[PDB]
Ligand binder design. Structure first.
Ligand SMILES: CCCCCCCCCCCCCCCCCC(=O)OC[C@H](COP(=O)([O-])OCC(O)COP(=O)([O-])OC[C@@H](COC(=O)CCCCCCCCCCCCCCCCC)OC(=O)CCCCCCCCCCCCCCCCC)OC(=O)CCCCCCCCCCCCCCCCC
Ligand SMILES: CCCCCCCCCCCCCCCCCC(=O)OC[C@H](COP(=O)([O-])OCC[N+](C)(C)C)OC(=O)CCCCCCCCCCCCCCCCC
Ligand SMILES: Nc1ncnc2c1ncn2[C@@H]1O[C@H](COP(=O)(O)OP(=O)(O)OP(=O)(O)O)[C@@H](O)[C@H]1O
Ligand SMILES: [Mg+2]
Lengths: 108, 74, 256, 96, 231
């Protein structure tokens, strides 16, 4: 559960959102944290990542970061459809609903 | 002389592996050598010692017979 | 259920389909997070490439045969072919033709065991073309915004109810098959644009098509149902109903 | 202890086949031959790589940066390069 | 300086500059269902997702040895994208390749990842060496700054700022201190500083300002020519 951060081993922390308002804030904080993102303040819930300097390969790096922060195991079949901020918010909810009803994580 | 040379040539292979240990161990393109070098090394050792051991047995059989057969003829 | 499964965490429904170009197997299984240099083992042990091929290729292949072993326990594979092999094996030393006629029934059994233990693969492109043609589904789902949450598809064990499918009460067919060759499953879908989810349940069976001896479609959806759920709307779509399909077409009853 | 280890014998090989002593001669020659041929093939890709990476670019097309060219520009720049950029920045962007 | 004169240099039997579908005798031909009994083919529609997972792996498996260096992770990403963007930006029509360029490139990236999973890929070892040399130079600057000492890089910047003031105080007729003029001033200093490293500045003469250094010299008694004879 530990990772290196600037040469120092730090314990990694996982988040549990379970709330709509907390998801929209996390995705924006996530997308605004990526060094390739343009117009970070012009970014909203209905923002197309293509309009902010992000391509298909950047959505992967973002999804890879969602697994780090939330502990999800995202399949390669789901990544290429995450092209908007709205998509990350709805996917995160669909995963929380799946685990709350089916008692397990979705197929990876 | 033959057993000593073949033992030195086998030791030469062990140096070649040690001199190139980092490559044989970490580079996967040389994995087959890493895996089968000792099998070939044992098969080489076996031939060296087998021949020495067999020659040694025969020499001892030859020596014990000429001594026994000689006393019978005396 | 997926029969071929390694310790790899990603892409479970594609593990048997993907043909990698690796000379050997990767040192570690696909990482689910960024790890430390000390979490992994440098210069993996000797004979590691062989160990991986056994636990990543051989072992999951035998777990597939064991998972679906109930589909090969037919009197033809169990008694007939092994008995045919023993009859000619007693004369194997007389000529070569006896060695052949004794090994052929074994190669034939392996082929039936091989094909019957594979994961049932339907033509998924035919399926998606079918649902994306329905307007009630395209309202909430699109290929550019759809994602898979769960997948299940497995053969049905034993013979079915002998009133809905009287075809399988055939002693000649039962001699070759102990299963039905039908499969049942579902698809858990989600749309990241509309926020909708649906469970696409389906039942399949092999059917004959346009020909006398060959099967037309080994996995024909004779029942296809979608239970769509949205923000506050629940819909139930019926793309293929079994009551209307079973009156037009009947199963195929594979032999050999 | 088993009889399979008898294959290690070469003192009395003339009693069974006397073939091992002549076959390995070919194997050593075959290895030497393949060593000369294969080493020539895999080594001689460097003249083409050296020439193309230095003479194949043209002005009517875009030359895209490679992985190595990215690491060198960002993590292998020298002192003169660091000074020149800050020298241009201070004079024009700050001091005009 | 020198241009290729042959106008037919880029000609192939398949067209001009065609490196995607070279002309061969056994050319691809169609297949008809009604007449085809069986077929053996390895082509599939799995290359897209394999192109996605291959990126996720090569990125995540390389970051294991970056030690949390954020500036290196971002630099590596830019380099990783340059490797995956080759089919999208090349002159070669990757969509017209002989038997599917998608499967070809994906299978090629898989061979790179295999080496990456073992931390034996030459791009990895090159990144470690390049980065260590960079941090050794950055730490040298830090150790000199904590002591209040001046770095060799700041001494140049200050020496260049004052030279600009001297050159523009006489440039009154015009008032366009072009970027060209700013450049030749810095390069002239660089050439003198570059030669100063091998021959440091002893006196007011400056870096590499002694003629006696270029008189006849001899190898020291303790370090003779080890590789060849001397006479
Ligand atoms: C014209 C007259 C003709 C005379 C004939 C003789 C001609 C000269 C022969 C020269 C070749 C033989 C070398 C003999 C030693 C000479 C000294 C020397 O090396 O030169 C100075 C040499 C420096 O070289 P340099 O020229 O000045 O500059 C080099 C550059 O810097 C670059 O640095 P570098 O390190 O990369 O350079 C390496 C350098 C030097 O490399 C070395 O490190 C020298 C060590 C070579 C060892 C040879 C193998 C012996 C294995 C050990 C046997 C031990 C037996 C007793 C065991 C007792 C304990 C139980 O070159 C070599 O490697 C020479 C290798 C020669 C080819 C061997 C090929 C063998 C396969 C073919 C077999 C053919 C049958 C005959 C085999 C006979 C074997 C007995 O000095 C050193 O290297 C100091 C080493 C200090 C630490 C050594 C620690 C011990 C290492 C032992 C290795 C253990 C291996 C695994 C165990 C095996 C046992 C089971
Ligand atoms: C009385 C003695 C019994 C007879 C002994 C028979 C020995 C059989 C084992 C040696 C033969 C190995 C030949 C393999 C050649 C083909 C390669 C291969 O394996 O493909 C696997 C393949 C793997 O899949 P694949 O290779 O076809 O494709 C994989 C696709 N990707 C890459 C995308 C994943 O699977 C199978 O072929 C099916 C499983 C066959 C199992 C083989 C026999 C296993 C025997 C188990 C019982 C043995 C009991 C003895 C142990 C007792 C305790 C010590
Ligand atoms: N039109 C074709 N032409 C030549 N070879 C083919 C063709 N279709 C399939 N093949 C080969 O037969 C294999 C299996 O085909 P199949 O359609 O069952 O794959 P699939 O991944 O299950 O498709 P889907 O996702 O639609 O279910 C393929 O991997 C291919 O090697
Ligand atoms: Mg399929």
């Amino acid at each position: 559960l530990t990772q290196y951060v600037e040469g120092q081993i730090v314990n990694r922390n996982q988040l549990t959102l379970k709330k709509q308002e907390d998801i929209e804030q996390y995705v924006l904080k996530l997308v605004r944290g990526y060094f390739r993102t343009t117009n970070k303040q012009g970014l909203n819930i209905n923002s197309v990542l293509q309009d902010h300097g992000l391509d298909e390969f950047d959505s992967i790096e973002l999804a890879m970061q969602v697994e780090e922060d939330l502990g999800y195991v995202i399949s390669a079949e789901t990544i290429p459809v995450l092209n908007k901020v709205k998509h990350f918010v709805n996917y995160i909810n669909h995963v929380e609903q799946f685990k709350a009803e089916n008692g397990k994580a979705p197929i990876a | 002389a033959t057993a000593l040379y073949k033992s030195s040539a086998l030791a030469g292979n062990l140096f070649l592996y040690a001199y190139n240990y980092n490559n044989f161990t970490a580079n996967i393109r040389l994995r087959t050598m890493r895996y089968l070098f000792p099998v070939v090394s044992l098969a080489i050792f076996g031939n060296i010692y087998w021949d020495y051991r067999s020659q040694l047995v025969k020499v001892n059989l030859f020596d014990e017979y000429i001594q026994a057969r000689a006393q019978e003829l005396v | 259920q997926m029969g071929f499964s390694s310790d790899n965490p990603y892409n479970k429904r594609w593990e048997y389909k993907w043909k990698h170009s690796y000379y050997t197997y990767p040192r570690d299984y696909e990482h689910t997070e960024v790890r430390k240099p000390q979490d992994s083992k440098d210069v993996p042990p000797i004979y590691f490439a062989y160990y991986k091929d056994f636990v990543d290729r051989w072992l999951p292949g035998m777990n597939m045969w064991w998972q679906r072993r109930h589909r090969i326990f037919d009197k033809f594979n169990v008694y007939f072919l092994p008995g045919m092999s023993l009859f000619f094996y007693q004369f194997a030393d007389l000529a070569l033709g006896f060695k052949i006629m004794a090994a052929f029934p074994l190669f034939l059994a392996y082929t039936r065991i091989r094909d019957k233990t594979l994961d049932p693969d339907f033509k998924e492109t035919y399926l998606r073309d079918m649902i994306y043609q329905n307007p009630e589904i395209t309202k909430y789902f699109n290929e550019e915004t759809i994602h898979v949450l769960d997948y299940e598809f497995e053969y049905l064990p034993g013979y079915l109810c002998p009133e809905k499918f009287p075809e399988y009460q055939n002693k000649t067919w039962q001699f070759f098959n102990t299963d039905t060759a039908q499969a049942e499953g579902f698809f858990k879908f989600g749309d990241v644009e509309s926020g909708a989810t649906m469970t696409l349940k389906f039942k399949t069976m092999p059917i004959p098509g346009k020909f006398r001896y060959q099967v037309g479609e080994p996995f024909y959806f004779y029942d296809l149902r979608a239970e769509i759920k949205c923000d506050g709307v629940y819909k139930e779509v019926v793309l293929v109903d079994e009551k209307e399909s079973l009156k037009k077409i009947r199963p195929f009853l594979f032999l050999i | 202890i088993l009889d399979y280890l008898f294959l290690l014998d070469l003192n009395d090989d003339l009693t069974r086949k006397a073939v091992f002593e002549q076959v390995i001669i070919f194997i050593f020659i075959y290895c030497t031959m393949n060593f000369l041929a294969w080493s020539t093939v895999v080594e001689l890709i460097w003249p083409t790589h050296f020439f193309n990476r230095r003479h194949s670019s043209s002005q009517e097309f875009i030359r895209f940066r490679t992985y190595t060219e990215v690491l060198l520009k960002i993590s292998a720049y020298n002192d003169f390069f660091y000074v020149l950029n800050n020298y241009y920045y201070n004079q024009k962007l700050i001091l005009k | 300086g020198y241009k290729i004169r042959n106008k037919s240099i880029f000609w192939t039997r398949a067209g001009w500059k065609n490196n995607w579908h070279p002309k061969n005798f056994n050319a691809p031909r169609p297949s008809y269902g009604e007449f085809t009994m069986g077929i053996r083919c390895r082509n599939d529609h799995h290359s897209f997702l394999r192109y996605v997972q291959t990126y996720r792996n090569m990125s995540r498996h390389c970051k294991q040895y970056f030690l949390g260096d954020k500036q290196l992770e971002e630099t590596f990403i830019l380099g990783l994208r340059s490797l995956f963007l080759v089919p999208y930006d090349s002159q070669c029509l990757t969509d017209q390749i002989k038997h599917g360029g998608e499967r070809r490139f994906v299978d090629q990236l898989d061979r790179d990842f295999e080496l990456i999973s073992y931390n034996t890929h030459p791009y990895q070892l090159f990144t470690y060496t390049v980065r260590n040399e960079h941090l050794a130079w950055k730490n040298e600057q830090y150790e000199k700054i904590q002591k209040g000492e001046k770095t060799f890089e700041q001494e140049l910047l200050d020496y260049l700022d004052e030279q600009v003031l001297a050159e523009k105080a006489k440039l009154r007729d015009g008032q366009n201190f072009s970027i060209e003029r700013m450049t030749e001033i810095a390069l002239h200093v660089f050439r003198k500083a570059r030669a100063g490293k091998v021959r440091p500045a002893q006196d007011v003469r400056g870096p590499d300002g002694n003629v006696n250094d270029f008189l006849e010299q001899r190898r020291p008694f303790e370090h003779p020519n080890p590789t060849g004879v001397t006479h």
